[PDB]
């Protein structure tokens, strides 16, 4: 059944996970990036140095033109383009085909990535944040409305060691995760906003006001690489991680992800870096579960050469809220249960780990006043 969709995401490692799609009639194949952070469907529609192909509206018989321009700014990069519609399909997804809004990307700055092998972007969020407003049914909202696929998808992003994944449209593939699923309510349907109720580093409470963790918002977002924390929370986590891992001294510039750390191949002392835990507001009143990544999720590997492995620190600061990007997701099977307004995590059956540690989802934990953790205005 969903086996057709298992392994349907590829990625040039550190350049984002993408699912192949076709656009228009006849169907021009394009690799689209999977992004739960954005809510806009958009494909490169005019040449650019970085992308080896693009969308030629001229050659698509099913292509209409909406006669309105669009501007989208990402935390990293931005583009502007022309809004069309056209027939969309997914080879290693459901054998269905919809008319869905498409943004033809005709101008961009620091968006496309060199070597990334993607050429477009699939914003999977909700319409509330679509650009230029909520009258632009996001691709998925249409896919469900126009077909029989149920309102739900799940993502298993698979990291590399010393890249691949699966986006399951409409269902849950039980072969991709181990143990139970645990669900946190989606706080509001715009981003996939969740509420973190406690943070631990190697088990040590960060001991900050619950609000500070969701300061602005905390969202799940496959498009972002790092785990991104609000400043007070970042500076706090860097101290605690520095503390624990202090078995080795470190350039001030490493924690800013400006410098890389290197060891003779394989001799990477994983055991000295702390695990990180996020507790999430659970489905049941006054209850909560935690999720725990390893150094192997927050130390993204980077291909200097030689017989040495090098890693970049993938926890960075953020002015706009927590962002649980690939660093977190690379450790779990994440189920975006749009239907039941909730999100589930389960230990991804393909998360990099070592002999002595592994990523974890675990619960429940008695937590009170969790509703008190969400920020406002």
């Amino acid at each position: 059944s969903f086996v057709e969709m298992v392994d349907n995401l590829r990625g040039k490692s550190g350049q984002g996970y993408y699912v192949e799609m076709t656009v228009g009639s006849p169907p021009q194949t394009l690799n689209i990036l999977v992004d739960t952070g954005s809510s806009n469907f958009a494909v490169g529609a005019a040449p650019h140095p970085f992308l080896h192909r693009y969308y030629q509206r001229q050659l698509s018989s099913t292509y209409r033109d909406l006669r309105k321009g669009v501007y989208v700014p990402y935390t990293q990069g931005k583009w502007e383009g022309e809004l069309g519609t056209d027939l969309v399909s997914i080879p290693h997804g459901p054998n269905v085909t919809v008319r869905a809004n498409i943004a033809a990307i005709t101008e961009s700055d620091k968006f496309f990535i060199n070597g990334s092998n993607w050429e477009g972007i699939l914003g999977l969020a909700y319409a509330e944040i679509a650009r230029p407003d909520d009258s632009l049914e996001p691709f998925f909202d249409s896919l469900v409305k126009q077909t029989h696929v149920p309102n739900l998808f799940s993502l298993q992003l698979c990291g590399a060691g010393f890249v691949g994944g699966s986006m399951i449209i409409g269902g849950i593939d039980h072969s991709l995760y181990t143990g139970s699923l645990w669900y946190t309510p989606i706080r509001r349907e715009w981003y996939y906003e969740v509420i973190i109720v406690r943070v631990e580093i190697n088990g040590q409470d960060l001991k900050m006001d619950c609000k500070e963790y969701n300061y602005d918002k905390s969202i799940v977002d496959s498009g972002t690489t790092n785990l991104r924390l609000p400043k007070k929370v970042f500076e706090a986590a860097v101290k605690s991680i520095k503390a624990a891992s202090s078995t080795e001294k470190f350039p001030d510039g490493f924690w800013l992800g400006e410098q890389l750390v290197c060891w003779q191949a394989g001799t990477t002392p994983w055991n000295i870096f702390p695990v990180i835990s996020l507790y999430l507001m659970g489905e049941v009143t006054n209850q909560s579960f935690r999720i725990t990544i390893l150094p192997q999720q927050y130390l993204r590997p980077v291909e200097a050469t030689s017989q040495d492995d090098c890693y970049k620190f993938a926890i960075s600061q953020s002015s706009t809220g927590t962002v649980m990007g690939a660093v977190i997701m690379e450790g779990f099977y994440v189920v975006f249960d749009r239907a039941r307004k909730r999100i589930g995590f389960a230990v991804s059956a393909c998360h990099v780990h070592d002999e002595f540690r592994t990523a974890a989802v675990e619960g429940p934990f008695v937590t009170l006043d969790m509703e008190d953790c969400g920020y406002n205005i």
Partner: peptide
Amino acid sequence: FLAXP
């Protein structure tokens, strides 16, 4: 990836 809201 969105910035602003």
